[PDB]
UniProtKB/Swiss-Prot annotation:
GO MF annotation, one: pyridoxal phosphate binding
UniProt entry tagged with the keyword Methyltransferase: no
Annotated SUPFAM superfamilies: PLP-binding barrel (SSF51419)
Species whose genome carries this gene: Escherichia coli (strain K12)
UniProt xrefs under NCBIfam families: YggS family pyridoxal phosphate-dependent enzyme
Phenotype when the gene is knocked out: During the stationary phase, the deletion mutant exhibits a completely different intracellular pool of amino acids and produces a significant amount of L-valine in the culture medium. The log-phase mutant displays slightly decreased coenzyme A levels, accumulates 2-ketobutyrate, 2-aminobutyrate, and, to a lesser extent, L-valine. Also exhibits an increase in the levels of isoleucine and valine metabolic enzymes. The mutant also accumulates gamma-L-glutamyl-L-2-aminobutyryl-glycine (ophthalmic acid).
Gene giving rise to this polypeptide: yggS
Protein name: Pyridoxal phosphate homeostasis protein
Length: 229
């Protein structure tokens, strides 16, 4: 027998592996992040018992409480991503506790995170979020704004610019999912030619995973398919 979370993780990892191989990539090129927002520490603990080490949280206090909880238990090897929209007033908590911030879309927030990172911690890994296809969102920048933001973020020494992220508008057609993901892959490839250690393209959830992986995503973030509704 397996518990549901372990079963689900095995299923998702296998789908990712098959997609990678199918498009000529090594499965190791794709990092699975478990989206644990709204799920209790006990659920994360089951995921950890099933080998999962990287988790994404959307709400600052919830995430910090979980991070502290596992620190207190002495659980090692975890990586925590903050992937919610970040309000200025909560930036210090993120800077003090997270390993990655996925949603950088303004210089002011990057600068605060940089300035609030404790001296004893590694630099905070960051991705610049692109609004690639969502006319109904104000989160993420337009691609035309990327050069300006990336140059500024790259000069913040307590951050490490690692690449790009995006959450496309939901799309029913595979061909459109792929076209949008391809646009992100092109932007990502270009960024690599201009900055060091650009190695992360955070793109794709369950319904658009196949398109994202085929296009070049390196980091997929899955919630419901791991933890249930």
């Amino acid at each position: 027998m397996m518990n549901d979370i372990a079963h689900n993780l095995a299923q998702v990892r296998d789908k990712i592996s098959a997609a990678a191989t199918r498009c000529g990539r090594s499965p190791e090129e794709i990092t699975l992040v478990a989206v644990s927002k709204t799920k209790p520490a006990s659920a994360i603990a089951e995921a950890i018992d099933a080998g999962q080490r990287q988790f994404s949280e959307h709400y600052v206090q919830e995430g910090v409480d979980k991070i502290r909880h596992f620190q207190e238990l002495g659980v090692t090897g975890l990586e925590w991503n903050f992937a919610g929209p970040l309000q200025s007033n909560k930036s210090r908590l993120v800077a003090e506790h997270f390993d990655w911030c996925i949603t950088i879309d303004r210089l002011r927030i990057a600068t605060r995170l940089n300035d609030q990172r404790p001296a004893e911690l590694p630099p905070l890994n960051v991705l610049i979020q692109i609004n690639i296809s969502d006319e109904n969102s104000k989160s993420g920048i337009q691609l035309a704004e990327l050069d300006e933001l990336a140059a500024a973020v790259a000069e913040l020494p307590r951050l490490r610019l690692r690449g790009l992220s995006a959450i496309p508008a939901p799309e029913s057609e595979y061909v459109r999912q792929f076209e949008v993901a391809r646009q992100m892959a092109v932007a990502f490839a270009g960024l690599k030619t201009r900055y060091p250690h650009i190695d992360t393209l955070a793109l794709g959830q369950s319904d658009d995973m196949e398109a994202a992986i085929a296009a070049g995503s390196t980091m997929v973030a899955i919630g419901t398919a791991i933890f249930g509704a």
